[PDB]
Design a protein around this motif. Structure first.
Motif, PDB file in Angstrom:
ATOM      1  N   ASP B  31       0.844  -1.199   0.000  1.00 16.89           N
ATOM      2  CA  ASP B  31       0.000   0.000   0.000  1.00 16.89           C
ATOM      3  C   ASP B  31       0.887   1.259   0.000  1.00 16.89           C
ATOM      4  OD1 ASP B  31       0.685  -0.365   2.661  1.00 16.89           O
ATOM      5  OD2 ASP B  31      -1.390  -0.315   3.431  1.00 16.89           O
ATOM      6  N   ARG B  38       7.193  -3.197  -1.660  1.00 15.57           N
ATOM      7  CA  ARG B  38       7.275  -2.147  -2.614  1.00 15.57           C
ATOM      8  C   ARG B  38       8.762  -1.942  -2.919  1.00 15.57           C
ATOM      9  NH1 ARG B  38       2.700   1.877  -2.581  1.00 15.57           N
ATOM     10  NH2 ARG B  38       3.298   3.273  -4.292  1.00 15.57           N
ATOM     11  N   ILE B 139      -4.089  -6.782  -3.850  1.00 18.71           N
ATOM     12  CA  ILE B 139      -3.621  -5.491  -4.315  1.00 18.71           C
ATOM     13  C   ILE B 139      -2.768  -5.680  -5.580  1.00 18.71           C
ATOM     14  CG2 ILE B 139      -1.659  -5.558  -2.709  1.00 18.71           C
ATOM     15  CD1 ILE B 139      -2.047  -2.385  -2.540  1.00 18.71           C
ATOM     16  N   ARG B 140      -2.950  -4.764  -6.523  1.00 19.54           N
ATOM     17  CA  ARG B 140      -2.248  -4.715  -7.804  1.00 19.54           C
ATOM     18  C   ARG B 140      -1.949  -3.242  -8.115  1.00 19.54           C
ATOM     19  NH1 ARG B 140      -2.180  -3.921 -13.136  1.00 19.54           N
ATOM     20  NH2 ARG B 140      -2.129  -5.510 -14.795  1.00 19.54           N
ATOM     21  N   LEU B 141      -0.689  -2.950  -8.442  1.00 16.03           N
ATOM     22  CA  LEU B 141      -0.229  -1.625  -8.853  1.00 16.03           C
ATOM     23  C   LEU B 141       0.412  -1.730 -10.239  1.00 16.03           C
ATOM     24  CD1 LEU B 141       1.779  -0.593  -5.654  1.00 16.03           C
ATOM     25  CD2 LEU B 141      -0.553   0.074  -6.171  1.00 16.03           C
ATOM     26  N   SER B 142       0.350  -0.633 -11.010  1.00 12.30           N
ATOM     27  CA  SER B 142       1.115  -0.506 -12.227  1.00 12.30           C
ATOM     28  C   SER B 142       1.502   0.962 -12.449  1.00 12.30           C
ATOM     29  CB  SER B 142       0.373  -1.073 -13.396  1.00 12.30           C
ATOM     30  OG  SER B 142      -0.740  -0.266 -13.727  1.00 12.30           O
ATOM     31  N   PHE B 143       2.567   1.150 -13.223  1.00  8.20           N
ATOM     32  CA  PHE B 143       3.250   2.420 -13.297  1.00  8.20           C
ATOM     33  C   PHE B 143       3.283   2.880 -14.753  1.00  8.20           C
ATOM     34  CE2 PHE B 143       4.628   0.157  -9.532  1.00  8.20           C
ATOM     35  CZ  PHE B 143       4.460   1.111  -8.552  1.00  8.20           C
TER      36      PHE B 143
END
Ligand SMILES: CCCCCCCCCCCCCC(=O)O
Ligand SMILES: CCCCCCCCCCCCCC(=O)O
Lengths: 154, 154
Positions: B31, B38, B139-143
């Motif tokens: 998060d 991270r 949770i999934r993040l992308s940039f």
């Protein structure tokens, strides 16, 4: 966001909902518990006149606070406005009334998959993902049944 | 995690990578900028003996710190161990060496989609999502390309 529910009957979204999944265009909208669009829907209360009162929980200043906001109707049944310094649109993408409802908030974009019960509905999550695959989402969260029954999904 | 790359040649993963997307089993792993998994991969350096040195960036104590960690080989080419109080396995799911590499870290689970260049590779993201659809990710993040060229993807 060019998916809206045709023939929406807003009276029929009344009652209990659970924010099973959330997604947003920018990580910082959802990352922390205290992030701006980390809001957990509790109940929808359509008014007679077809406005939509929303009860939700939001972590602010170290605690889970209950908030009440009113989304006002527009000439489109599936589109509501929230009164702020900025005009923000609520769009109802899709619902079967009895299990799931997909919506997005746009000014930047956050969307949710609401469900009627503290259960992971794979079907609703699939429809959620399909609706999102068009949109520029950079964060997605989802919650387990235990979390769904806690204030602010702790 | 029961997807591993058959016939992996670890020497061929050498060089520059970009952490285009990340996912984890628990929201609190990804998060905040200072969340435990991270981590932003910079470079992979396989040794002769077939261990894997990893250069990465990690936000700690209010700044983007450069870290160097060694993942030691096992008897399985696609599986490496990281020496800590807890034994953590690195698993290489899939790679074409010249564009993308998917891996997971497991003790709880975090996975990434690495790419060779600061570009959104939809094909690699699709394979990432397909590999994850089995796993319990919350949770999934992308940039975006701009973020990919900044330290700690700020
Ligand atoms: C049809 C369901 C729509 C639910 C819309 C929820 C909208 C959340 C408004 C933005 C967050 C408000 C938090 C606050 O009070 O500062
Ligand atoms: C084949 C690519 C594998 C890359 C593995 C990266 C593993 C990250 C290790 C866990 C985070 C370490 C942060 C720290 O130094 O405390």
């Amino acid at each position: 966001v060019t998916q809206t529910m045709k023939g929406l009957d807003i009276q029929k979204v009344a009652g209990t909902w659970y924010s099973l999944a959330m997604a947003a265009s920018d990580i910082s909208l959802l990352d922390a518990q205290s992030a701006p669009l980390r809001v957990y829907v509790e109940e929808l209360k359509p008014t007679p006149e077809g406005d939509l009162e929303i009860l939700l929980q939001k972590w602010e200043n170290g605690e889970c606070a209950q908030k009440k906001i009113i989304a006002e109707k527009t000439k489109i049944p599936a589109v509501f406005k929230i009164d702020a310094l900025n005009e923000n649109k609520v769009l109802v993408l899709d619902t079967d009334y009895k299990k799931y409802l997909l919506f997005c908030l746009e000014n930047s974009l956050a969307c949710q998959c609401l469900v009627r019960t503290p259960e992971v509905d794979d079907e609703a999550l699939e429809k959620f993902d399909k609706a999102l695959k068009a949109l520029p989402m950079h964060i997605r969260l989802s919650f387990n049944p235990t979390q769904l029954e806690e204030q602010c999904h702790i």
